[PDB]
Amino acid sequence: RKASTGNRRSHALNSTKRRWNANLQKVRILVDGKPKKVWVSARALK
Amino acid sequence: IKKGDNVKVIAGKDKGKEGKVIATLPKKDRVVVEGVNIMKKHQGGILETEAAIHVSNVQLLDPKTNEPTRVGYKFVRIAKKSGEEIK
RNA sequence: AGACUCGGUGAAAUCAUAGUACCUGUGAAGAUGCAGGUUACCCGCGACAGGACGGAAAGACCCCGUGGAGCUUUACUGUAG
RNA sequence: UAGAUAGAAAAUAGGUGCCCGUACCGCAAACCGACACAGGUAGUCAAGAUGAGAAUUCUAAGGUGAGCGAGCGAACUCUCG
RNA sequence: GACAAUGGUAGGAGAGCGUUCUAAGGGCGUUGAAGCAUGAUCGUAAGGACAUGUGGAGCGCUUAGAAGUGAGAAUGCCGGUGUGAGUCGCGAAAGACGGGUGAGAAUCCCGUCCACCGAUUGACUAAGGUUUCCAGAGGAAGGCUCGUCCGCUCUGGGUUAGUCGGGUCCUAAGCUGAGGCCGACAGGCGUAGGCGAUGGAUAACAGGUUGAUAUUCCUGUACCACCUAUAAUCGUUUUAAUC
RNA sequence: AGGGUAGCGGAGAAAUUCCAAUCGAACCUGGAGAUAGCUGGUUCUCUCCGAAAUAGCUUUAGGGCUAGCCUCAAGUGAUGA
RNA sequence: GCUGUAAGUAAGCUUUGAUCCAGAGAUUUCCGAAUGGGGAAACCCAGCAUGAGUUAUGUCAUGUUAUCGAUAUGUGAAUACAUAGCAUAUCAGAAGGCACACCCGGAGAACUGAAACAUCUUAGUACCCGGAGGAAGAGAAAGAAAAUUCGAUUCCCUUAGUAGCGGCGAGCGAAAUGGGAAGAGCCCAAACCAACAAGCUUGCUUGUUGGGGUUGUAGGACACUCUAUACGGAGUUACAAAGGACGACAUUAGACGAAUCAUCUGGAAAGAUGAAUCAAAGAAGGUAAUAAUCCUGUAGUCGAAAAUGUUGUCUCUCUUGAGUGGAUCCUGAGUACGACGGAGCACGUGAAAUUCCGUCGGAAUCUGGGAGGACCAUCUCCUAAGGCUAAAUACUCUCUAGUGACCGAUAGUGAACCAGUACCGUGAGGGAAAGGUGAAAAGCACCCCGGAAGGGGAGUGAAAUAGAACCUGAAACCGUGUGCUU
Ligand SMILES: [Mg+2]
Ligand SMILES: [Mg+2]
Ligand SMILES: [Mg+2]
Ligand SMILES: [Mg+2]
Ligand SMILES: [Mg+2]
Ligand SMILES: [Mg+2]
Ligand SMILES: [Mg+2]
Ligand SMILES: [Mg+2]
Ligand SMILES: [Mg+2]
Ligand SMILES: [Mg+2]
Ligand SMILES: [Mg+2]
Ligand SMILES: [Mg+2]
Ligand SMILES: [Mg+2]
Ligand SMILES: [O]
Ligand SMILES: [O]
Ligand SMILES: [O]
């Protein structure tokens, strides 16, 4: 999917403002059902 | 809507007069008829051509009297107040 | 060479109205314009430059503003890395 | 050289040969500079006597007379002796 | 009829005038509306009638309603007009005379003299500007004066290439960049190749000629590539001439 | 001559210097009629009344709030001087 | 009658019906997504096929030539298998544009208010990007609620600036019951069967179609009973399946369309004066001055060869519909949920439900599961983890017809006129001033001075002190003369 995903605020311990990502997990592999490669999550690879 | 027939000019310079017409000029809405003579000049002292007026005019055929011209039935053809002969 | 006279052409910043003296005094406490005196026919032209708290520039100095920017730090709180 | 491919053309005759730009000023009155503005504006040629010399002084080639002038010959300022 | 009060900024309260428009009613108007101008008039004020002149077609009045409803001042915006002032300036510079023209000339044309630059105020091209170029007329404004003139107006007319600078040849810096790697989207990077000259290679010279074009036109003499036509060399299409 | 780097930036033999005549962070548009306890300006007549410049608190003293001091309409009712 | 604005001249056209109006069609150079290559936009350079002209080359005419994907081919081998790639063909695919409007989604600020400010607010606004529509979004209950329960969604009112959130300050802000507009509900997945498929364990199961079946008061499967029958029918092409014939209405040119005479003034009447008329038409504008009866016009009525649009009936298609019983099976998995950080729900981590995001762990199978504002129990209601859906609504670049206690040239669009122009700036971009002769051009023949310009005269016209810088023509400002005075 390859997207900075969930871009919202980051509060400190006293709640100033700051933007962040939550960049969703993706790791690349030789796909075990098609001989090519692509970014893939871990949550699918259970 | 007129091509050289009779009229009576009623509401202009001098009235009670009649005459026969030349160019109608559909855009400017101004007809040419005996009854106005401008003293134009070129390089004569005067020229005495013929000038125009707006339609303050009316027709007269049978009654020998002005009437509202009234194009009536299709036989189009003119059909005046009292009498119905061609325009 | 400019300036100055004659011919030609012809701007400007400025400008509350003006027929615009001086002294001593008063006064926002340094007056062409006020009080009291003094002298001075009306109008010019060329020069000087004391005054018009003259012009030009909503004072560059100083201060105020719970005005603003830039900069520093062992000021606070946060942050990229 | 791999390869093409039957097997040329000496020198001869004849013809065929596209688009753009080309005028003018270009150390200037025409470009930038708001002006017909004492500014800048790369490059080539660059003669004669004197001189080491593209320096300097005077002249060829050639170009120009500078887009207000006539008077008087005071202050004052400026430029020169 | 008496009695008393009636200065006044900030500011509070009250009554009022006029403008534009609307609704209704009633009226005026070429036998001259509105506006404008003049005036010695009415009202306590804001204001309003009247007479006259100009003007050349719409307007008032009473009652009430709604308002973009009033302007002397913003270092206020716009426009016009002065003041300064016929005053400073007229943008380095050597001109003079004669003869013409013309309505009219210090300034225009012609000539003679004079003076000036001369590693230049000269001659040639690039960038650049875009018809300013030339002829014939014109002088309303422009020209820092005048102007019979101009780079201003009006009409008409002018720029010629197989060989010149360039393209159909090449390329660096750099730019773009299939596929591709990256990034939230946009898009960013970059190979292949491709574009891009101030450089590299490249076939031409002298003279003459117009008011205005010149290695472009003509005059003569030359060159490169190419096709077509023609033959003196080749000989399995090998290798040999040959690409 | 041809090219590059662009403003929360660039380049800087470093001066806070240059970045299309401007630089303690360019330029145009949009947010935006930003904000201002500050200055300046606020349009037609009359009539009646008529002050204050103090107390307190105020990251407040040139601002604000409340009480004072005014006005208007009701009410009280002779309480006031 | 015509040869636009825009005059004027000359040539010509037109009852054999021009010009003009409306609909269809033909052409539609070049640039521009630009698309054969390249490119300083509107220029250049090529390729291939065919075909013009040459003896022949140069030169031309037409057509064709990008990329991407998504299909069909062949071909592929770095490695044999065969994939990456490679050459070719097809597609009305897409790219781009825009109305700065309205919608959804991604990302996403600061001045400011707080009397300062960091939580906060402004604001989830701006601008940017993306996508689609003519409307979008949402959506058919894993609700709302607590009764005599109702049974998609959206919008308007109202509840309410209430309840609540909050450095409890600033401020923010619902929802439900109720009254209304519009009213619509449906298909998959799964368990079951048939068919074909590799593993054929010769066990059946997975892979693909068709059926089959779509839910809470539980439903379907499976078994059983009837309806229907290739149709009695419901069909509904705007979801529910996707194609086509044939009538009515509106739109794009238009036509008809009642009625008045005179006197005075006047340069000219449409006014005053009188006597008359039509009215389904006294709305409006023009006409030499103010017009129901002069013209255009209106009320009303008629009218479309062709094209479009919306509607209708037969074609047209396509379809079985209920009930019982519930032995056995199925009811959407790395999902739901929890924690951790965050967002959003009016709701700031607060006791904080409910919903979404990322990492990580990690349930059940109807005697089930979720909610009912922490959490457990009883009760009540509903059944996610798959999808579609008209109207009611918001806006108007634009057109048609209309309207205004809206402006009437320093106002109003910036723009009434040849304006996004001249102009300024390298460029993004910013941005002007300027309406009126008269009724009609009848726009000053002719004389005179003058080089001309300009003027005095004469004439056109009611008026030329209306004569083109032309209605009206104020004040500043400048003059000429003059009563009084210095
Ligand atoms: Mg003089
Ligand atoms: Mg050139
Ligand atoms: Mg010069
Ligand atoms: Mg020498
Ligand atoms: Mg004024
Ligand atoms: Mg002479
Ligand atoms: Mg330096
Ligand atoms: Mg402001
Ligand atoms: Mg008070
Ligand atoms: Mg298409
Ligand atoms: Mg949490
Ligand atoms: Mg999660
Ligand atoms: Mg006016
Ligand atoms: O402003
Ligand atoms: O403002
Ligand atoms: O402002």
Side-chain angles (χ1 to χ4, degrees), chain B:
Chain B
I1 61 178
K2 304 178 175 66
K3 302 178 186 177
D5 59 352
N6 284 326
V7 294
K8 184 176 75 175
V9 65
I10 190 175
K13 178 66 182 293
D14 297 335
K15 63 181 287 295
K17 294 187 288 185
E18 295 81 2
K20 294 182 185 296
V21 300
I22 314 296
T24 297
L25 297 166
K27 295 181 184 296
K28 296 184 287 292
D29 296 329
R30 292 183 186 274
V31 302
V32 173
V33 66
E34 296 174 351
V36 296
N37 293 318
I38 57 173
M39 294 177 186
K40 178 62 67 61
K41 56 181 75 177
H42 293 285
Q43 189 178 11
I46 56 174
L47 182 66
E48 293 293 331
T49 189
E50 302 181 355
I53 59 178
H54 193 275
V55 173
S56 65
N57 290 324
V58 291
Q59 293 182 1
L60 59 98
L61 188 156
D62 180 72
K64 304 297 295 298
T65 297
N66 52 1
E67 297 302 343
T69 183
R70 177 67 65 190
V71 63
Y73 297 165
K74 298 175 176 63
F75 295 94
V76 296
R77 187 178 65 190
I78 194 67
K80 300 177 177 68
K81 181 176 292 301
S82 178
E84 297 180 353
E85 180 168 356
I86 59 169
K87 185 176 69 171

Side-chain angles (χ1 to χ4, degrees), chain A residues 8-12 16-20:
Chain A
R8 291 186 179 85
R9 288 174 179 172
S10 174
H11 292 285
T16 61
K17 183 182 291 186
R18 177 177 71 97
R19 307 291 287 176
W20 63 293

Side-chain angles (χ1 to χ4, degrees), chain A residues 10-45:
Chain A
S10 174
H11 292 285
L13 300 173
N14 291 317
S15 302
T16 61
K17 183 182 291 186
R18 177 177 71 97
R19 307 291 287 176
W20 63 293
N21 283 305
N23 194 347
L24 58 86
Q25 177 64 255
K26 300 289 275 188
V27 294
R28 294 172 63 90
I29 187 168
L30 295 167
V31 173
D32 294 329
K34 182 168 71 68
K36 294 182 177 178
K37 294 172 69 68
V38 63
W39 290 100
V40 176
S41 299
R43 184 69 176 171
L45 293 175

